[PDB]
Design an enzyme around this catalytic site. Structure first.
Site, PDB file in Angstrom:
ATOM      1  N   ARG A 104       0.869  -1.171   0.000  1.00 36.67           N
ATOM      2  CA  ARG A 104       0.000   0.000   0.000  1.00 36.67           C
ATOM      3  C   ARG A 104       0.905   1.220   0.000  1.00 36.67           C
ATOM      4  O   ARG A 104       1.470   1.566   1.038  1.00 36.67           O
ATOM      5  CB  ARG A 104      -0.929  -0.001   1.208  1.00 36.67           C
ATOM      6  N   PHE A 143       1.533  10.504   1.228  1.00 36.18           N
ATOM      7  CA  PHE A 143       0.999   9.964   2.467  1.00 36.18           C
ATOM      8  C   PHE A 143       2.011   9.048   3.114  1.00 36.18           C
ATOM      9  O   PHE A 143       2.649   9.438   4.090  1.00 36.18           O
ATOM     10  CB  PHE A 143      -0.298   9.200   2.214  1.00 36.18           C
ATOM     11  N   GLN A 189       3.541   1.619   2.926  1.00 33.15           N
ATOM     12  CA  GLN A 189       3.317   0.628   3.965  1.00 33.15           C
ATOM     13  C   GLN A 189       3.653  -0.768   3.461  1.00 33.15           C
ATOM     14  O   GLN A 189       3.304  -1.141   2.341  1.00 33.15           O
ATOM     15  CB  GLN A 189       1.862   0.682   4.472  1.00 33.15           C
ATOM     16  N   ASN A 244      -1.599  -0.481  12.529  1.00 34.90           N
ATOM     17  CA  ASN A 244      -2.402  -1.272  13.450  1.00 34.90           C
ATOM     18  C   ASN A 244      -3.871  -1.125  13.101  1.00 34.90           C
ATOM     19  O   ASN A 244      -4.275  -0.218  12.372  1.00 34.90           O
ATOM     20  CB  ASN A 244      -2.180  -0.870  14.920  1.00 34.90           C
ATOM     21  N   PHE A 260       4.720   1.688   8.379  1.00 37.91           N
ATOM     22  CA  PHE A 260       4.622   2.579   7.234  1.00 37.91           C
ATOM     23  C   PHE A 260       5.679   3.659   7.352  1.00 37.91           C
ATOM     24  O   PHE A 260       5.995   4.110   8.452  1.00 37.91           O
ATOM     25  CB  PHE A 260       3.201   3.180   7.081  1.00 37.91           C
ATOM     26  N   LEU A 289      -1.982  11.098  13.257  1.00 40.44           N
ATOM     27  CA  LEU A 289      -1.730   9.760  13.764  1.00 40.44           C
ATOM     28  C   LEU A 289      -0.965   9.794  15.075  1.00 40.44           C
ATOM     29  O   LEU A 289      -0.670   8.735  15.637  1.00 40.44           O
ATOM     30  CB  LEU A 289      -0.964   8.918  12.729  1.00 40.44           C
ATOM     31  N   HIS A 326      -0.480   5.694  16.460  1.00 40.32           N
ATOM     32  CA  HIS A 326       0.540   4.824  15.908  1.00 40.32           C
ATOM     33  C   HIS A 326       1.863   5.157  16.568  1.00 40.32           C
ATOM     34  O   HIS A 326       2.202   6.328  16.738  1.00 40.32           O
ATOM     35  CB  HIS A 326       0.641   5.001  14.410  1.00 40.32           C
TER      36      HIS A 326
END
Length: 163
Positions: free
Chosen positions: A54, A59, A62, A101, A112, A121, A125
């Site tokens: 991904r 962004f 990951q 997660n 990521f 985040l 995270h």
């Protein structure tokens, strides 16, 4: 001294470059140790051969899912999952290394790499590392991504280990 791991990235089997990370074991020792032991494969499993499934430009990239290769699997060295160690470190900008997660205290092996600042985040995270060398190689991975995350080519970790 904070340990250093590296990834040798390949695009559809073709070498692309090396990405190295500083793991902040001094601030998040449990999380940094999981990632470190998965990069060396010293527990029998790990990241060598897994992919970045991904990648979203602007962004994050990951990967780390070495049991289901799509984001629905992975496991830590401590078991199927493990808790959130702390949220001392923030997603300050590109190069940050943080754990993926599916809710509170469900960290496994999926991480990521931030390709942008992701302050929303913070507290959700765990940040445990940052890119040290090869941020250019991460930006080249980013271009094989897409707005929905499906990669145009297979981005794999051809080799990983510790320095």
């Amino acid at each position: 001294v904070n340990p250093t791991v590296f990834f040798d990235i390949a695009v559809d089997g073709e070498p692309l470059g090396r990405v190295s990370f500083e793991l902040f074991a001094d601030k998040v020792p449990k999380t940094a140790e999981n990632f470190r032991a998965l990069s060396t494969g010293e527990k029998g499993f790990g990241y060598k051969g897994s992919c970045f499934h991904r990648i979203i430009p602007g962004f994050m990239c990951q990967g780390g899912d070495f049991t289901r290769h799509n984001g629905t699997g992975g496991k830590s060295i401590y078991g199927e999952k493990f808790e959130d160690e702390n949220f001392i470190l923030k997603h300050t900008g590109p190069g940050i290394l943080s754990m993926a997660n599916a809710g509170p205290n469900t960290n496994g092996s999926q991480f990521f790499i931030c390709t942008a600042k992701t302050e929303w985040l913070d507290g959700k995270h765990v940040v445990f590392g940052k890119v040290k060398e090869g941020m250019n190689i991460v930006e080249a991975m980013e271009r094989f991504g897409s707005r929905n995350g499906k990669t145009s080519k297979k981005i794999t970790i051809a080799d990983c280990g510790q320095l």
